[PDB]
Design a protein around this nucleic acid. Structure first.
Lengths: 62, 52, 421, 134, 341, 36, 176
RNA sequence: AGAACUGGCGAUGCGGGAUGAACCGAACGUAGAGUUAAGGUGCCGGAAUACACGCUCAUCAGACACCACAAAAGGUGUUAGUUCAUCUAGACAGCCGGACGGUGGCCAUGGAAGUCGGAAUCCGCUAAGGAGUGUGUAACAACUCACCGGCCGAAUGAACUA
RNA sequence: AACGAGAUUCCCACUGUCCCUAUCUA
RNA sequence: GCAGUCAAGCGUUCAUAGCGACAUUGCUCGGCUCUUCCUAUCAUACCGAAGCAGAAUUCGGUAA
């Protein structure tokens, strides 16, 4: 989306960071990124594979 | 069986159409338009046959 | 049938079972009739519904009865194994209740159809149909307990291991948490926990391995101290054509006295007396020779941290279980190396060629560039093959120029003679 | 089951109720078709087999060992004019088929006469028990 | 039957008009989108098949192709259409000032009785510095969202005894409407070749009025045939040339022969000009005018991407049975005859 | 989607008058049931 | 497939990363989706949903109330009985056809003073109201007093029927 | 379903109920004018897209009618009520913390410490904490709420009826 | 026991009855 | 279905003039061929639940 910037987390394995201004842009893009990776016609319990929003937060922490 | 209008197959074919599948047609079109441009010059030479 | 049973149609919990069979008779049969029709069509309507619900419940009940293994008719190991894991009397009580209920439903359907050919109004006929399917519902409502049991047994028998009582087996025994979990962990690919407490394992885990070109199966056990988990082990020792590998911990570990292992070995001695026992050690030393007083025993000292002696125990176990003109080779092949799949430096096969060129079914293999010629400029072969009614290959030979000139001599020998005038 | 790779359309010459000869040295001399495995479905149309199609067929004239049981049969000779991709239309002298298990493995040890090119391509073990191809 | 192909009635004319056109890209060079000829012919080809994944990869396949005769189409006008809430609307057509005898024939039903006074005042309308023609061409370039080319066929170069050519309308899928109308300006009275529209390995959709069978007897009785049908995805196997001998020659056969069979096609003449050898069977019969459009869209599968390597062209006698490719091979096999010597 | 059949709001004269007879029937029942 | 192939997998690899977020949000959605189903679901599914939801309310009333209370501390088309002397009994019943399907022999009788139901055979049809013909035919319409066999076993020998056996399956009687 | 008495139709046109055997109006010579009945006043359609207070949003609303059938209900639709409750000794919501020792109560049993289950289900200490509300571990632990307490500052809660 | 254009069933041969229609003539 | 167990309330006050829902406990004329339509769908399409390891399957939703 126009206004969301993607960088990878250095020194932490298997992490993608989504950052911008609008809540809709960042969060809908996060939702899109995990709904393309649907485990299809299989287990939920057995197949862990997928992308997941580990942390929702702010750019500048105070 | 997946239909002719099955959404996933239409999207997979759109993945095709942005690759090799259009590029070959966009080279063929240039070769066709080239020979079309070549067809003007021959007829213009047969204009200059009478103009001679 | 044979070793395992995963293939069983599921067991509905007697409330949902009603919601399956009764809804299907509402959806699959015609549902709309006027009171103003002929009595014959009203009769035939409700008869068709009572009968169809009859076949409905019977179909679901027959699936349960034929699906579950006939406990006392399978195999002595499995007859007793299911008897240990499940209350065998209750397992036969439950299936007896289904066999009873199916005959009940059959009786109900056969009753109300016979009673239905005498209905005089649509109301009377409706009351009789409602009576029939309601009666069937009452029968199925009386089955809320055995079907709840049958779903749990279906789930837990569906996950049970498949031991073969006719293949070469070897039981792995000892006190709970001796270190026999580490043995099967380091002999085969089977994930068994070595968690530091008594009853970590709760059932018979199986591990397959191959030695001397043969299929072997080593059966891990929970252990003997009586419980359903405990008696599972003992009956596995008793009914399997096997050798038993009783494991001992000559250390501070396990949390049990070695003398208690001696007492237990000599107590359980009668039922493994026929099985040719191996004992593996993972006044005081003299009481190991008290264990040696058994007719068929052998003692071995091993460590699970090293991978050689664990293999040697297997070797002796399998050995116990069995007793119970010149060719033409080109030097271009002899000098050639082996194909290592995880090597960064080797030749690229056609498999990797088609991947690099893209796709499996999209790449066309060039038959050219792979054949040997005098000039590789003429590699891209055209080869006419046909010229004017006569194919080229029939005319094609070496020395055709000299052969043509021979025919040219045969021209001039007929040229001057005067055949062409 | 058993058939190797894709299968392309050739003309249908052997409907249900057709007696073909038997070609292997198993014991049977003839074969009566009762059903064709993997056929289309029209109204009133009989199931029609062709060369290299597994049919369900019974022995009519042969050894009693091969009878008592309806078994799969792969047609090796057609005698109706089918087309090859190499120009020509061809046909054989008689209708013949060979008996096999559902897996596509042959019971007999040798097949007499010519075996069709298409049939020997599709079924590998028929070509293993073949004397003549084409 | 198929309820889409209704009403199952006789068409408006033998020349069926093309219902839809390929889209438009406004960066592509100016090129024609549909072509017309005269379907007459059918013949057999063998080729080696480079279709990977198939049971016939690096094998040889025999197949039936059709020969449409396509003389070089001649441009005699241009039409401009405005985009309306009512569809399209032709606001201005412009012609070529001096048109053939064939098209002035198309404007009359009875040709011989007329004074042949068709475009006399229109050609006299041109007769100056232009002034009004350039005014109407400005009118087209200013407005008119799509621009279609008026063409006609070279009927005399075809062996047909009709003498009367067909007018048509062909849109342009070359961007900038300026370049459309100015391509037309560069092409008045001029002709357009076949291979300047098509080439080998190109999918087309040949449209034709389908072979009339007359009266016939919910599965209803009435008319069978003479319907305007569009058939899509017929691969062009060969584009040919009239002046060039050895059109029947392949990379393999290489004998100097024309694709025309011995004694020509049945009910139709030879070929004396450009042709398209299209795979399969195009609707209509022989002597029938077909209009060849191109694909509508990017239709690339491996049935559209593969290169055709033609191996041999059957030019044996269709009238009778086929035994000889050339006349030369008939009297080579035969020996010499009675009236010869 | 395939839009399914809509119920009518036209009450036929047989329905409307039959409604009145059924209503007056409910009255005669209610007057009797009031006495008990 | 060994024994607990998914439980060990949980006890070594976990459920999912979002398994707790999906579950918690779903249970929080169910408060809406009960109401979203109740205002949709046309037809039979609406009637079944209403019946199940009414049941799920009465059961909850019982849980809460019990907790609050434990807080403190011509042929006949009617069903008949025919006595065992049937073979040549009809002297006065010339053409009164009674089919064998409509003959119910054991009435499902309940005991009034002790709430136990004993399924016992009928011995004699005594007094059917509506018709004194029916007393002689053995018709078992509502209100018929019948004799009950007490072979299986304070008891009363007679029972009055309460159902209409032409409509339902069995004959249901209450002792006097 | 049976009587009685009563209207209507029948031998009766006309206004209305879109339409019509029994529904609402209606004392038929031929005309003119005025006023009305039942029904109506968006347009078809003659007559107010009047006025006034309200209620309703319907994934095929409703205009319908002794308010009669599916009809007892379900609904985190919405508006009115009624009866009990809390509340500036601080209501509901919200996080922050305590949420205790007898005590791992007895049998149970491999392991069951409140939370697999069988029975009482008691004491003390407080501001308040159940031989324990669910999640959880093999068993514990850890978290949770019900019960309090800390900031926060006005309304809120439950059960019914329309 | 042959029969009689008696009837039925089976075995062998034959055919557009059919799969599946296609064409020609009157 | 019959009888009982609860039992929101209403009974002319109101539980001891009585009715009473969901549960629950007692034993027990047929058939050949075509056209169109309906969904209460067997298959094909996409989903949800299920000890759903994979495969296979069971129930359920949208869907003509």
């Amino acid at each position: 989306r126009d206004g969301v910037t993607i960088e990878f987390s250095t020194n932490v394995k298997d992490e993608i960071v989504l950052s911008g201004n609008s809540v809709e842009d960042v969060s809908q893009n996060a939702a899109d990124l995990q709904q393309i990776c649907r485990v299809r016609n299989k287990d939920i319990r057995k197949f862990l594979d997928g992308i997941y929003v580990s942390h929702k937060g702010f750019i500048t922490e105070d | 069986a997946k239909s002719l209008r099955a959404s996933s197959h239409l999207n997979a074919k759109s993945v095709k159409r942005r690759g090799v599948f259009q590029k070959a047609v966009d080279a063929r079109e240039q070769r066709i338009s080239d020979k079309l441009k070549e067809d003007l010059l021959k007829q213009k030479l047969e204009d200059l046959k009478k103009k001679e | 049938m044979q070793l395992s049973w995963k293939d069983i149609p599921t067991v509905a919990p007697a409330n949902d079972l009603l919601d399956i069979v009764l809804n299907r008779t509402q959806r699959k049969t015609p549902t709309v009739i006027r009171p103003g029709f002929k009595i014959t069509r009203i009769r035939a309507f409700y008869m068709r519904k009572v009968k169809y619900t009859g076949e409905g419940f019977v179909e679901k009940f027959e699936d349960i009865l034929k699906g579950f293994p006939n406990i006392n008719d399978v195999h002595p190991f499995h007859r007793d194994l299911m008897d240990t894991l499940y209350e065998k009397n209750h397992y036969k009580i439950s299936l007896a209740a289904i066999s009873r209920a199916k005959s009940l439903v059959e009786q109900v359907a056969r009753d109300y159809v016979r009673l239905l050919k005498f209905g005089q109004s649509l109301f009377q006929c409706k009351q009789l149909k409602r009576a029939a399917l309601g009666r069937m519902a009452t029968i199925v409502k009386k089955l809320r307990d055995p079907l709840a049991y049958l779903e749990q047994v279906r789930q837990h028998i569906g996950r049970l291991p498949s031991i073969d009582p006719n293949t070469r087996t070897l039981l792995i025994c000892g006190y709970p948490n001796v270190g026999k979990s580490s043995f099967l962990r380091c002999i085969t690919k089977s994930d068994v926990d070595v968690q530091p407490y008594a009853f970590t394992t709760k059932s018979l885990y199986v591990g397959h391995f191959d030695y001397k070109y043969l299929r072997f199966q080593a059966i891990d056990t929970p252990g003997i101290l009586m419980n359903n988990i405990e008696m599972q082990s003992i009956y596995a020792i008793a009914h399997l054509r096997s050798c038993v590998l009783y494991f001992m911990d000559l250390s501070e570990q396990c949390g049990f006295t070695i003398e208690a292992q001696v007492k237990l070995f000599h107590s359980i001695k009668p039922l493994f007396a026929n099985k040719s026992v191996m004992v593996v050690i993972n006044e005081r030393a003299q009481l190991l020779e008290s264990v040696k007083e058994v007719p068929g025993v052998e003692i071995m000292t091993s460590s699970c941290q090293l991978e050689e002696n664990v293999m040697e125990v297997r070797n002796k176990a399998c050995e116990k279980l069995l007793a119970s003109r010149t060719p033409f080779i080109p030097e271009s092949v002899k000098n050639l190396k082996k194909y290592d799949p995880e090597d960064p430096n080797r030749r690229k096969l056609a498999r990797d060629i088609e991947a690099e060129n893209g796709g499996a079914g999209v790449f066309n293999v060039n038959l050219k560039d792979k054949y040997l010629l005098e000039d590789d400029e003429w590699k891209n072969d055209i080869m006419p093959e046909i010229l004017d009614g006569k194919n080229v290959y029939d005319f094609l030979d070496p020395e055709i120029a000299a052969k043509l000139q021979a025919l040219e001599e045969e021209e001039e020998k007929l040229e001057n003679e005067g055949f062409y005038n | 089951n058993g058939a190797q790779g894709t299968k392309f359309r050739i003309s249908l010459g052997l409907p249900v109720g057709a007696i073909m000869n038997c070609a292997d040295n198993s014991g049977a001399r003839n074969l009566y078709i009762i059903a064709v495995k993997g056929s289309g479905s029209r109204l009133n149309r009989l199931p029609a087999a062709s060369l290299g199609d597994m049919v369900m067929a019974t022995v009519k004239k042969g050894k009693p060992e091969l009878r008592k049981k309806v078994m799969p049969a792969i047609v090796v000779r057609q005698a109706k004019s089918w087309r090859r991709r190499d120009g020509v239309f061809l046909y054989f002298e008689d209708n013949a088929g060979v008996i096999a298990n559902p897996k596509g493995e042959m019971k007999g040890s040798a097949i007499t006469g010519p075996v069709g090119k298409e049939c020997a391509d599709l079924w590998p073990r028929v070509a293993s028990n073949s004397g003549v191809v084409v | 039957g198929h309820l889409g192909f209704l009403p199952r009635k006789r068409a408006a004319s033998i020349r069926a008009r093309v219902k839809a056109f390929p889209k438009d890209d406004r960066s592509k060079p100016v090129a024609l989108t549909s072509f017309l000829g005269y379907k007459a012919g059918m013949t057999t080809i063998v080729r080696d098949l480079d279709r990977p994944g198939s049971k016939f990869h690096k094998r040889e396949v025999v197949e039936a192709v059709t020969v449409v005769d396509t003389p070089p189409v001649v441009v005699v006008g241009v039409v401009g259409y405005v985009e309306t809430p009512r569809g399209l609307r032709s606001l201005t057509t412009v012609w070529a000032e001096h048109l053939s005898d064939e098209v002035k024939r198309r404007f009359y039903k009875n040709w011989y009785k007329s004074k042949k006074k068709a475009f006399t005042k229109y050609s006299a309308k041109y007769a100056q510095d232009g002034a009004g023609i350039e005014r109407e061409l400005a009118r087209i370039k200013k407005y008119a969202s799509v621009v279609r080319v008026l063409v006609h066929t070279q009927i005399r170069k075809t062996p047909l005894a009709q003498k009367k050519a067909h007018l048509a309308e062909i849109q342009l899928n070359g961007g900038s409407i300026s370049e459309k109308v100015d391509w037309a300006r560069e092409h008045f009275e001029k002709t357009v070749a076949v291979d300047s529209v098509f080439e080998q390995n190109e999918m087309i959709d040949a449209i034709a009025v389908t072979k009339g069978h007359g009266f016939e007897g919910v599965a209803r009785a009435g008319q069978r045939g003479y319907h305007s049908r569009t058939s899509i995805n017929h691969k062009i196997y060969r584009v040919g040339k009239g002046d060039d001998e050895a059109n029947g020659a392949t990379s393999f056969d290489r004998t100097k022969k024309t694709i025309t069979p011995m004694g020509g096609f049945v009910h139709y003449g030879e070929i004396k000009n450009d042709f398209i050898m299209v795979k399969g069977c195009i609707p209509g019969n022989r002597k029938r005018i077909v209009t060849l459009r191109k694909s509508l869209y990017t239709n690339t599968s491996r049935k559209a991407l593969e290169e055709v390597s033609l191996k041999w062209i059957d030019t044996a006698s269709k009238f009778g049975k086929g035994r000889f490719q050339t006349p030369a091979e008939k009297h080579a096999f035969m020996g010499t005859l009675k009236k010869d010597l | 989607m395939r839009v399914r059949k809509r119920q009518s709001r036209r009450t036929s004269t047989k329905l409307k008058e039959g409604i009145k007879k059924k209503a007056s029937a409910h009255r005669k029942k209610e007057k009797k049931m009031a006495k008990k | 497939p060994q024994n607990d192939y998914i439980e060990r997998h949980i006890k070594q690899h976990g459920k999912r990363l979002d398994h707790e977020e999906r579950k918690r949000k779903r249970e929080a959605r169910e408060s809406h989706k009960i109401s979203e189903r109740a205002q949709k679901l046309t037809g039979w599914k609406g009637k079944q949903f209403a019946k199940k939801r009414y049941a799920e309310k009465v059961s909850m009333r019982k849980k809460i109330k019990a907790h609050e209370q434990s807080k403190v501390k011509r042929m006949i088309t009617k069903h008949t009985f025919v006595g065992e002397g049937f073979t040549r009994r009809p002297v006065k019943m010339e053409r009164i056809i009674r089919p064998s399907a409509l003959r119910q022999k054991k009435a499902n009788v309940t005991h009034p003073e002790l709430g136990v139901t004993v399924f016992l055979p009928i011995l004699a049809v005594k007094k059917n109201p509506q018709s004194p013909m029916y007393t002689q035919l053995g018709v078992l319409t509502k209100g018929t007093i019948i004799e009950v066999n007490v072979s299986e076993l304070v008891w009363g020998k007679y029972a009055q029927v309460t159902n209409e056996p032409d409509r339902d399956g069995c004959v249901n009687a209450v002792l006097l």
